[PDB]
Amino acid sequence: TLVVTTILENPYVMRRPNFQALSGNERFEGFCVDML
Amino acid sequence: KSDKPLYGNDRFEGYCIDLLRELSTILGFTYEIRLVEDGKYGAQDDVNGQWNGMVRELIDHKADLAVAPLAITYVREKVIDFSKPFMTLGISILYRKGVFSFLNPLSPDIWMYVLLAYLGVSVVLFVIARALSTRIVGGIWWFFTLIIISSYTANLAAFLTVERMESPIDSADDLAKQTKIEYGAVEDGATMTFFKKSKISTYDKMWAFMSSRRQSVLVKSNEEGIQRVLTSDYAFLMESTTIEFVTQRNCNLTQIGGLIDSKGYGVGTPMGSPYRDKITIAILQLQEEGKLHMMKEKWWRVQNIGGIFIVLAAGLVLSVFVAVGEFL
Amino acid sequence: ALSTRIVSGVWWAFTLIIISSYTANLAAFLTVQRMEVPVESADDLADQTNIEYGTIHAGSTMTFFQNSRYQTYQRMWNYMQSKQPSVFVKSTEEGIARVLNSRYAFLLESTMNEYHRRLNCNLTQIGGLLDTKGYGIGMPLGSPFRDEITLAILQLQENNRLEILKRKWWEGMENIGGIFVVLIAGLIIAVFVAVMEFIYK
Amino acid sequence: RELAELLRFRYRLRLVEDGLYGAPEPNGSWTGMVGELINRKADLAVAAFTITAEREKVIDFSKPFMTLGISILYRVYFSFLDPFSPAVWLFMLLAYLAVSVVLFLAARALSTRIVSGVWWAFTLIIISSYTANLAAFLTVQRMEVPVESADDLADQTNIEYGTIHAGSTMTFFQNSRYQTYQRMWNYMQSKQPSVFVKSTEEGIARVLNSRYAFLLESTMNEYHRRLNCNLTQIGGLLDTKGYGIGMPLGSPFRDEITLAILQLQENNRLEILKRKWWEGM
């Protein structure tokens, strides 16, 4: 339960368009996201 | 280097070893030569401010004499004192020095389709034998060769004009505006300072490119920089007398440009070493002797038009053989 | 046969002058087209008052160049500060936008230029690496796992699936050719003319 | 002489003791003859004292003898087969004799047509190459400026920017504020053991010696370039100046000096003295 925060920047965090945005980690995916 | 064990005050040779020997024979000094522990000429640090290498060592007063090829820099003059100039010096730049090229400035598919068209127009002329038609055909052929040969001269014109405008890099600004050959020096350099702490903006931007890529641009040793220049385009800023005694024994190298700054290596001592002044006096005595200069002697010692000529001569022989065939 | 000799001579003089002029003019055009670099090293772009040097506004790149010490980078800081509302831009996608919009260059990261230039064709990765950097795992000072972060970081680089993830998510002769057209065309035309002549016969 | 003819007194004209043009040193002192006027070692500092700002606040300067500016004094039937690589032409004529010789062998029409077309292809190529290469040669020569604006020579690390050592011009560029002139001051200070030179005749000498330019006065460039032909007056006037009649502050006739100076300019024999002494294909 660690506060892992970021500002989205393509393509580091893909910021895939999941208009149904889930919570936290399941909200967005990418290279830095899979790295985390 | 030899076939036995020596050490210390016996394991070295060169011109500066002779400088130690003759300076000893003058001043009556005894001495043991010890190398630099940091393995560099050393500099006042980037953030610590303290000297590095031999400059740190004589700054620590941990060794008395420093007879090396050591630069008498005004920034280095504050850290420690020096004698008179042993050998005059300066920074300089060291760097190294067909039968399609007839048809070069036209791209090859075009010159292929040209010969195809020559055969084609010859075919149409043969088919004209089933003269106004002959005339019209001859005229389009005229226009054709004209555009082709004219545009040819344009391409060979321009592509000759640019390459005769580029080469070489034969100045400091020539190495400065370019970004192709890597330009630097060995680590902890008083040379690298005299580039780095300079205010001449060309040399400043050269320091910017060097310290920019400071992992790969800068070197560790002058012999290492020599290997970096002889291997690839990592051209080295380097010292004068080093550039001479490098260039005299490596013909594939070259000493480009003039003299960047004016310096002189010499005997260095910590501030308050009493033999500094008398050493400088006997150094002037040895400069009056000439054993400095004697030691410097003893130690510091049809491009493409030829292609088409071949093409034409080949055609000649082939058609003479065709004439032998006719005689047959 | 001197009257026609007068017209032959003047005609040769004329056709020669016009051909020499044409080859001259095409020589000058190709030469100018070839001699233009136009901006490759970044220092020129810093001097290039007609191009717009630009950075991801209030960024780590702005920290690098704006707080720099090297002289051309210092002039870049001055020009980046000078008309900065006209000159700075915040969003990275907006950085690609202003690159794809006018003569403004986005001073982006290396991997940024990588993902963008692989994604987009018309943007060129001009210049070399202006300096060295690395996107590192930030944390508070004295973190609960900063040593463990570097440890498992070296483990993951040793696991090398980071590079797997880099691949995964961080993934003339036509100039003068119209001559051939004119050729074929006139060839066919005169073929027709000669066929008409055979008919006349 | 005419100035003393106005002022009716004699003048012990002496050499400046230092003989430098004089500059305010970091010890507060004006050097040279500016030192002599800051010393009251002399009252009538009668020379080409460039009336500048630091020349103003140290001693009075009267109305100028003339205008002045800073200028840069810098240096400056066989082309027939010359654009061709000069050994190729012998092989060319040998080829012409050869191709005629193959034809004369072909005497004792298609076989001849073969070598005709070959000779034509080779002829087209090499005269196209000649016209191209002479095009490149004439183009490179025309496109070189090489240094006209002084800012270029300031950036030009290969040519040596140079000034009369510790001069009024060394003040005007060294104490300057304009950015390219500031970089010029930095380069003038930088390799100065190579870069600065003192005597003005030696200045013309070093300009006549290597790629060093004497940043001299306007009338200096006038008298020199009229005297010597090979030296070009590169650049325009870098600034405004005037060699004015220096004196101590509050001199015995300083206002009278400017007055009779305007009288002599009105008498215009000063300009008379300017003439009489400051005189492909």
Side-chain angles (χ1 to χ4, degrees), chain A residues 11 17 21 24 30, chain B residues 5 8 14 28 39 42-43 49 53 63 66 68-69 71 85 90 98 105 108 117 120 129 131 137-162 168 172 176 184-185 189-190 208 225 235 257-258 264 266 268 270 272 274 282 290 306-307 313-315 323 325, chain C residues 1 7-33 38 42 46 54 58-59 85 95 97 105 127-128 134 136 138 140 142 144 152 172 177-178 185-186 190 194, chain D residues 4 19 22-24 26 28 32 35 42 45 47-48 53 64 69 83 86-87 95 98 106-107 109 115-141 146 150 154 162 166-167 193 203 205 213 235-236 242 244 246 248 250 252 260 280:
Chain B
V137 163
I140 193 100
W141 171 248
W142 176 341
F143 196 95
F144 206 39
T145 166
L146 177 63
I147 303 301
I148 289 174
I149 286 306
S150 316
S151 73
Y152 179 85
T153 309
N155 261 322
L156 194 55
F159 152 77
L160 252 193
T161 318
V162 51
Chain C
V7 200
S8 71
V10 60
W11 173 256
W12 182 88
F14 162 66
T15 173
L16 188 137
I17 289 299
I18 180 65
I19 61 171
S20 163
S21 82
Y22 166 51
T23 309
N25 222 317
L26 189 42
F29 157 76
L30 277 165
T31 299
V32 295
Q33 193 133 101
Chain D
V115 309
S116 84
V118 165
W119 173 257
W120 163 56
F122 151 77
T123 313
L124 276 185
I125 282 299
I126 72 164
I127 80 160
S128 168
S129 293
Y130 175 34
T131 304
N133 203 348
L134 187 46
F137 177 81
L138 295 174
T139 311
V140 286
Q141 257 195 21

PDB file of all heavy atoms in Angstrom, chain D residues 223-242, unseen atoms left out:
ATOM      1  N   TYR D 223      45.678  57.143 -43.561  1.00  0.00           N
ATOM      2  CA  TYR D 223      47.060  57.445 -43.920  1.00  0.00           C
ATOM      3  C   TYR D 223      47.814  56.182 -44.295  1.00  0.00           C
ATOM      4  O   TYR D 223      48.623  56.188 -45.231  1.00  0.00           O
ATOM      5  CB  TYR D 223      47.762  58.162 -42.775  1.00  0.00           C
ATOM      6  N   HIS D 224      47.493  55.066 -43.642  1.00  0.00           N
ATOM      7  CA  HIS D 224      48.189  53.831 -43.967  1.00  0.00           C
ATOM      8  C   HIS D 224      47.746  53.256 -45.309  1.00  0.00           C
ATOM      9  O   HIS D 224      48.596  52.978 -46.161  1.00  0.00           O
ATOM     10  CB  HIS D 224      47.988  52.813 -42.851  1.00  0.00           C
ATOM     11  N   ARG D 225      46.442  53.077 -45.531  1.00  0.00           N
ATOM     12  CA  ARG D 225      45.963  52.504 -46.780  1.00  0.00           C
ATOM     13  C   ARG D 225      46.192  53.414 -47.970  1.00  0.00           C
ATOM     14  O   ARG D 225      46.280  52.922 -49.096  1.00  0.00           O
ATOM     15  CB  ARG D 225      44.474  52.171 -46.679  1.00  0.00           C
ATOM     16  N   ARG D 226      46.288  54.720 -47.766  1.00  0.00           N
ATOM     17  CA  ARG D 226      46.754  55.552 -48.855  1.00  0.00           C
ATOM     18  C   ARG D 226      48.243  55.394 -49.062  1.00  0.00           C
ATOM     19  O   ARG D 226      48.720  55.512 -50.194  1.00  0.00           O
ATOM     20  CB  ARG D 226      46.421  57.020 -48.594  1.00  0.00           C
ATOM     21  N   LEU D 227      48.993  55.111 -48.000  1.00  0.00           N
ATOM     22  CA  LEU D 227      50.421  54.908 -48.181  1.00  0.00           C
ATOM     23  C   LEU D 227      50.715  53.532 -48.762  1.00  0.00           C
ATOM     24  O   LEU D 227      51.612  53.385 -49.597  1.00  0.00           O
ATOM     25  CB  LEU D 227      51.149  55.108 -46.857  1.00  0.00           C
ATOM     26  N   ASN D 228      49.974  52.508 -48.345  1.00  0.00           N
ATOM     27  CA  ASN D 228      50.261  51.133 -48.741  1.00  0.00           C
ATOM     28  C   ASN D 228      49.034  50.498 -49.373  1.00  0.00           C
ATOM     29  O   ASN D 228      47.923  50.637 -48.856  1.00  0.00           O
ATOM     30  CB  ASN D 228      50.717  50.295 -47.548  1.00  0.00           C
ATOM     31  N   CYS D 229      49.247  49.763 -50.464  1.00  0.00           N
ATOM     32  CA  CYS D 229      48.124  49.332 -51.284  1.00  0.00           C
ATOM     33  C   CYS D 229      47.579  47.977 -50.862  1.00  0.00           C
ATOM     34  O   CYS D 229      46.389  47.709 -51.050  1.00  0.00           O
ATOM     35  CB  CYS D 229      48.538  49.287 -52.749  1.00  0.00           C
ATOM     36  N   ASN D 230      48.416  47.109 -50.299  1.00  0.00           N
ATOM     37  CA  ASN D 230      47.990  45.731 -50.089  1.00  0.00           C
ATOM     38  C   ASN D 230      47.097  45.549 -48.869  1.00  0.00           C
ATOM     39  O   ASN D 230      46.636  44.429 -48.628  1.00  0.00           O
ATOM     40  CB  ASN D 230      49.212  44.823 -49.969  1.00  0.00           C
ATOM     41  N   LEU D 231      46.834  46.600 -48.102  1.00  0.00           N
ATOM     42  CA  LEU D 231      46.049  46.497 -46.881  1.00  0.00           C
ATOM     43  C   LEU D 231      44.642  47.020 -47.123  1.00  0.00           C
ATOM     44  O   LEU D 231      44.467  48.160 -47.561  1.00  0.00           O
ATOM     45  CB  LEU D 231      46.708  47.282 -45.752  1.00  0.00           C
ATOM     46  N   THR D 232      43.648  46.199 -46.818  1.00  0.00           N
ATOM     47  CA  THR D 232      42.260  46.545 -47.058  1.00  0.00           C
ATOM     48  C   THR D 232      41.598  47.053 -45.786  1.00  0.00           C
ATOM     49  O   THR D 232      41.843  46.553 -44.681  1.00  0.00           O
ATOM     50  CB  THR D 232      41.484  45.342 -47.594  1.00  0.00           C
ATOM     51  N   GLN D 233      40.737  48.051 -45.968  1.00  0.00           N
ATOM     52  CA  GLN D 233      40.047  48.730 -44.880  1.00  0.00           C
ATOM     53  C   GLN D 233      38.755  47.993 -44.574  1.00  0.00           C
ATOM     54  O   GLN D 233      37.667  48.498 -44.866  1.00  0.00           O
ATOM     55  CB  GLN D 233      39.758  50.184 -45.243  1.00  0.00           C
ATOM     56  N   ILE D 234      38.878  46.824 -43.957  1.00  0.00           N
ATOM     57  CA  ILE D 234      37.746  45.941 -43.734  1.00  0.00           C
ATOM     58  C   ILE D 234      36.864  46.537 -42.647  1.00  0.00           C
ATOM     59  O   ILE D 234      37.347  47.194 -41.706  1.00  0.00           O
ATOM     60  CB  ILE D 234      38.200  44.527 -43.361  1.00  0.00           C
ATOM     61  N   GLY D 235      35.564  46.310 -42.796  1.00  0.00           N
ATOM     62  CA  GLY D 235      34.580  46.796 -41.857  1.00  0.00           C
ATOM     63  C   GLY D 235      34.215  48.240 -42.122  1.00  0.00           C
ATOM     64  O   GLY D 235      34.883  48.971 -42.849  1.00  0.00           O
ATOM     65  N   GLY D 236      33.106  48.642 -41.519  1.00  0.00           N
ATOM     66  CA  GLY D 236      32.731  50.036 -41.459  1.00  0.00           C
ATOM     67  C   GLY D 236      33.251  50.638 -40.178  1.00  0.00           C
ATOM     68  O   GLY D 236      34.048  50.032 -39.460  1.00  0.00           O
ATOM     69  N   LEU D 237      32.800  51.851 -39.889  1.00  0.00           N
ATOM     70  CA  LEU D 237      33.177  52.528 -38.657  1.00  0.00           C
ATOM     71  C   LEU D 237      32.533  51.802 -37.485  1.00  0.00           C
ATOM     72  O   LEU D 237      31.306  51.693 -37.420  1.00  0.00           O
ATOM     73  CB  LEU D 237      32.750  53.993 -38.691  1.00  0.00           C
ATOM     74  N   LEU D 238      33.362  51.282 -36.577  1.00  0.00           N
ATOM     75  CA  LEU D 238      32.834  50.499 -35.464  1.00  0.00           C
ATOM     76  C   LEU D 238      32.119  51.386 -34.456  1.00  0.00           C
ATOM     77  O   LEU D 238      31.161  50.950 -33.810  1.00  0.00           O
ATOM     78  CB  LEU D 238      33.955  49.714 -34.789  1.00  0.00           C
ATOM     79  N   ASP D 239      32.556  52.633 -34.319  1.00  0.00           N
ATOM     80  CA  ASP D 239      31.901  53.606 -33.461  1.00  0.00           C
ATOM     81  C   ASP D 239      32.329  55.001 -33.876  1.00  0.00           C
ATOM     82  O   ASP D 239      33.015  55.183 -34.884  1.00  0.00           O
ATOM     83  CB  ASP D 239      32.239  53.391 -31.983  1.00  0.00           C
ATOM     84  N   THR D 240      31.921  55.984 -33.085  1.00  0.00           N
ATOM     85  CA  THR D 240      32.303  57.372 -33.295  1.00  0.00           C
ATOM     86  C   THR D 240      33.398  57.737 -32.308  1.00  0.00           C
ATOM     87  O   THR D 240      33.396  57.258 -31.171  1.00  0.00           O
ATOM     88  CB  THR D 240      31.109  58.307 -33.116  1.00  0.00           C
ATOM     89  N   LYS D 241      34.323  58.579 -32.743  1.00  0.00           N
ATOM     90  CA  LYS D 241      35.403  59.032 -31.884  1.00  0.00           C
ATOM     91  C   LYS D 241      35.922  60.347 -32.438  1.00  0.00           C
ATOM     92  O   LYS D 241      35.492  60.812 -33.496  1.00  0.00           O
ATOM     93  CB  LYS D 241      36.515  57.988 -31.800  1.00  0.00           C
ATOM     94  N   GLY D 242      36.859  60.948 -31.709  1.00  0.00           N
ATOM     95  CA  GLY D 242      37.552  62.121 -32.185  1.00  0.00           C
ATOM     96  C   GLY D 242      38.788  62.402 -31.350  1.00  0.00           C
ATOM     97  O   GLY D 242      38.734  62.483 -30.118  1.00  0.00           O
TER      98      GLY D 242
END
